[PDB]
Design an enzyme around this catalytic site. Sequence first.
Site, PDB file in Angstrom:
ATOM      1  N   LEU A   1      -9.259  -6.338  -7.043  1.00  0.00           N
ATOM      2  CA  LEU A   1      -9.213  -5.142  -7.880  1.00  0.00           C
ATOM      3  C   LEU A   1      -9.999  -4.000  -7.233  1.00  0.00           C
ATOM      4  O   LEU A   1     -11.154  -4.197  -6.838  1.00  0.00           O
ATOM      5  CB  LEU A   1      -9.834  -5.461  -9.235  1.00  0.00           C
ATOM      6  CG  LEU A   1      -9.951  -4.245 -10.172  1.00  0.00           C
ATOM      7  CD1 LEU A   1      -8.606  -3.650 -10.523  1.00  0.00           C
ATOM      8  CD2 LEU A   1     -10.723  -4.633 -11.434  1.00  0.00           C
TER       9      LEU A   1
ATOM     10  N   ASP B   1       2.838   2.347   6.457  1.00  0.00           N
ATOM     11  CA  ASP B   1       2.945   3.165   5.224  1.00  0.00           C
ATOM     12  C   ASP B   1       1.577   3.763   4.840  1.00  0.00           C
ATOM     13  O   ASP B   1       1.197   3.806   3.663  1.00  0.00           O
ATOM     14  CB  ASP B   1       3.607   2.317   4.093  1.00  0.00           C
ATOM     15  CG  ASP B   1       4.123   3.157   2.892  1.00  0.00           C
ATOM     16  OD1 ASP B   1       4.522   4.349   3.038  1.00  0.00           O
ATOM     17  OD2 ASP B   1       4.168   2.581   1.768  1.00  0.00           O
TER      18      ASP B   1
ATOM     19  N   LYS C   1      -0.962   6.491   3.874  1.00  0.00           N
ATOM     20  CA  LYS C   1      -0.914   7.766   3.140  1.00  0.00           C
ATOM     21  C   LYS C   1      -1.960   7.694   2.030  1.00  0.00           C
ATOM     22  O   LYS C   1      -2.393   6.608   1.703  1.00  0.00           O
ATOM     23  CB  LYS C   1       0.460   8.002   2.537  1.00  0.00           C
ATOM     24  CG  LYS C   1       0.981   6.910   1.634  1.00  0.00           C
ATOM     25  CD  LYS C   1       2.363   7.202   1.087  1.00  0.00           C
ATOM     26  CE  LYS C   1       2.823   6.090   0.159  1.00  0.00           C
ATOM     27  NZ  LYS C   1       4.101   6.478  -0.521  1.00  0.00           N
TER      28      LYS C   1
ATOM     29  N   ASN D   1      -1.934   5.096  -0.720  1.00  0.00           N
ATOM     30  CA  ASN D   1      -2.211   3.716  -0.274  1.00  0.00           C
ATOM     31  C   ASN D   1      -3.641   3.486   0.234  1.00  0.00           C
ATOM     32  O   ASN D   1      -3.902   2.540   0.988  1.00  0.00           O
ATOM     33  CB  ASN D   1      -1.148   3.260   0.764  1.00  0.00           C
ATOM     34  CG  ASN D   1       0.208   3.050   0.129  1.00  0.00           C
ATOM     35  OD1 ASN D   1       0.320   2.885  -1.113  1.00  0.00           O
ATOM     36  ND2 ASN D   1       1.259   3.005   0.956  1.00  0.00           N
TER      37      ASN D   1
ATOM     38  N   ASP E   1      -1.200  -1.858  -0.115  1.00  0.00           N
ATOM     39  CA  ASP E   1       0.261  -1.847  -0.011  1.00  0.00           C
ATOM     40  C   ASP E   1       0.809  -2.181   1.387  1.00  0.00           C
ATOM     41  O   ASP E   1       1.232  -1.302   2.159  1.00  0.00           O
ATOM     42  CB  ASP E   1       0.874  -0.527  -0.483  1.00  0.00           C
ATOM     43  CG  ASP E   1       2.357  -0.670  -0.778  1.00  0.00           C
ATOM     44  OD1 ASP E   1       2.982  -1.689  -0.372  1.00  0.00           O
ATOM     45  OD2 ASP E   1       2.917   0.223  -1.442  1.00  0.00           O
TER      46      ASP E   1
ATOM     47  N   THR F   1       7.336   7.156   3.764  1.00  0.00           N
ATOM     48  CA  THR F   1       7.406   8.399   3.014  1.00  0.00           C
ATOM     49  C   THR F   1       7.537   9.556   3.997  1.00  0.00           C
ATOM     50  O   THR F   1       6.697   9.680   4.878  1.00  0.00           O
ATOM     51  CB  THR F   1       6.097   8.507   2.188  1.00  0.00           C
ATOM     52  OG1 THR F   1       6.124   7.482   1.176  1.00  0.00           O
ATOM     53  CG2 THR F   1       5.929   9.859   1.555  1.00  0.00           C
TER      54      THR F   1
END
Length: 278
Positions: free
Chosen positions: A94, A138, A140, A143, A160, A179
Amino acid sequence: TVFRQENVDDYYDTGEELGSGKFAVVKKCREKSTGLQYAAKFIKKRRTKSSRRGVSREDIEREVSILKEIQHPNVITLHEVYENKTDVILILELVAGGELFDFLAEKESLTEEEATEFLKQILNGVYYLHSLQIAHFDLKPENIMLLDRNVPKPRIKIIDFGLAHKIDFGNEFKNIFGTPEFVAPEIVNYEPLGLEADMWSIGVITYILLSGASPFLGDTKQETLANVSAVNYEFEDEYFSNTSALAKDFIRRLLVKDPKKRMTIQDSLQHPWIKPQF
């Protein structure tokens, strides 16, 4: 690979929704046996071999194996995996301080010191991944998650790993596209990809951290991708007038079309600024 098929609700209680995309939703949860809290990411499975909805088993197994290999303060930690007919459910560490994306939106512009403090943690996490020949593909602000957003120098974790790949042959040639604002020219041009693509994404993130503006963003996805391929960006004086020339040098050496000429992760740690879709 087969995962735990007991009902996740027999072992965890879920709560607040933390995040979500096209085929996944993340919920805060608590383990009944220990009281410890995690993030449960529910990934929708494909219903048939040829479907476009859901994530393929191959894609899910690849994210899971990658996650099982990593352990570093700047990357998320996988606790366990469950599955049922409809979903694979990853019980992940978490990270409760929210996305770096939201932190940047909510807060005043960043100083060069605040920007490097985040950047150094990202570079350390990517150094770890690249050392294991893992390309994230990925990277960004959405993330990158903060552990606690109320401290002056928030600690972060990369998240991610849904597009991440092991690159054991120097490059991979697959269906891999992130993206538009953050993808490298080689992604845009559908060429073989390696660890270099992450280094480009780092240049984009750095530009955003310093300025609050996205270097390649156009009015449509096609315009963004066209700008990326042509390396159509500049340092706007209005946004960069009190940014050091060495910060700009750093970005310049990452936002390089030829992947062979781009700074590597090791180069980025030795750079004088740092060294101590349709």
